[model samples]
Target: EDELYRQSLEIISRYLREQATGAKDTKPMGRSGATSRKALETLRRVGDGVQRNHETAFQGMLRKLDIKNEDDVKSLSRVMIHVFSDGVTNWGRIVTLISFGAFVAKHLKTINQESCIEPLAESITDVLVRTKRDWLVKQRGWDGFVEFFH
Candidate 1:
């Protein structure tokens, strides 16, 4: 169970890394392109904020949860989903969610479970798109993220 959780986190870390660096060559073109670029930019900022402002909290949270295997990873996702569902839908909450996933991904690496990264990413994506698709679309997706942080 604990291994499952670690795999999940590894997935998230890899996903964020790809978002941050992998698509750099693609140029922003049409509407979707522009929006995607903005979204990516905002995501980078959110990641920076996570490291600067939320790292301590994340450390404490991870320690409290003591994720040693797969089950803990599952528990982490449940906690994340609960947090996401708790409040009025807003960019702030969304940013935190993404940032937290990044943090968890970092943690996964420390434990040498890099192989699980993709699965973790998939789970996070599933949660966001499945739960907040309408809200995200209404906000104009990544374009709204860029504006919200701007």
Candidate 2:
């Protein structure tokens, strides 16, 4: 399980980075790509919800943080992991975490640190899959997210 978890972190991070950058070959390449497509779509909806419903609060949180480089991004990622881990496990909370990540990705793009987006996504995935794997699996992974938000 631990080995699989570590491998997933690497594979998913690269897959997400490619999607974020709008790579020319973004088509689903394999099983991992197929799976991450759903994950990415689910996160996009989660991000859009935050943009629509909590833009102000999300901006306030971003203003309070300092993220100028990869290290700072990693620090913020760790903080986010702590934030989610300490909270109750629910789809709403999970949405919030992914939404926060979306805001962070935007921030990174604004600051021209687009390179850090991959690591940020990896961290988000790490926290969720590492800490809430059972619950997420019980909920049917990203399939559950699509249904929950529908």
Candidate 3:
């Protein structure tokens, strides 16, 4: 298991170094182009799958919020409370929450007749419930948009 992982790391490093130094001439190369092409294709396929999965997850959460009036929209911020953790380790959740906020802010008038988009934007991204405001302010750069909610 470890051998394959290390092997790929070494192979990738060698490939990168060869490219950087103009040492990647095809005729003298030890490995064929198919080797690097397959590795790159597999990596790209993995990325595509991850991106599709997250799009589904983000859309699902937006539906769950069921934001009706401005009040319902306000509750979406609670998701952020559970997600944003110490040192921002829960980056997936952070990104999901941010996406959710933006989606709500975008479809507000269409989805629920909510008009105060700016204030809603502030609340959803404010890093709150929000006793942790100071901590969030220091840990994350999103605080620039948090003032409206504070």
Candidate 4:
């Protein structure tokens, strides 16, 4: 799992760099434009529901998603894992990650990287461990748990 995680990170880093570079170019923008627009559109939709501190960075990533071809889909998982490792979990990113999974599960997209199953597991577990009761109450429900515990 650790090996896969490291490999995934490497793929993510290289892929994002390429995407960031490609987004600014005008020629051969077909693939980049198509992928970038879709990714940004998805992020904005999800962003509408969630806000977090590094919102700008999240937006920046949307812009940088330019190079995701049919092949580059799996790297999405790698990038999400690294972001979550630093406690970057937010509604926009989480929802987008869910969308990425659906895209992969259909057995269509490629652009393979190290698998994300373990990475996601580690990240969600971290979120669960670090999540405070107050946070959940404000974001989710309150009533019995808060009143009884607090």
Among the numbered candidates, top lDDT falls to 2
- Per-residue C-alpha lDDT of model 2 across residues 1-150, encoded as one tens digit per residue: 464355345444544454356453444444445555565566555656666699898888887777789989878866876778888998899778777776777678778899899788788878888889888778877567667876
The alpha-carbon lDDT assigned to residue 107 of candidate 2 equals 79
Model 2 regions lying over 4 Å from their true place: 1-25, 32-39
Q: List the lowest-lDDT window of 10 residues for candidate 4.
A: 141-150
The window of 10 residues in a row where model 1 has the poorest summed lDDT is 2-11
- Per-residue CA lDDT of candidate 1, range 1-150, in tens? 333223323333444655434444343233345555555566677765866787788788878878776667767777767877666888887777777776776677768765555556766766766677788678876557778887
Q: Sort every candidate by lDDT, greatest first.
A: 2, 1, 3, 4
User: Whose TM-score is higher: candidate 1's or candidate 3's?
Assistant: 1
Misplaced by over 4 Å in model 4 are 1-47, 51-57, 86-150
lDDT of each: 0.64, 0.70, 0.45, 0.37
Deviation from native of the Cα of residue 12 in model 1, angstroms: 7.4
lDDT of 4 at 94: 41
lDDT of 4: 0.37
Model 3 Cα lDDT, one tens digit per residue, 85-138: 333533334334444554554456555454546555456434532434454345
Q: How big is the positional error of residue 42 in model 1, measured in Å on the Cα after superposition?
A: 1.7
- Name the candidate that leads on TM-score: 2
Alpha-carbon RMSD to native, per candidate = 7.1, 3.4, 17.9, 15.0
TM-score of 1: 0.74
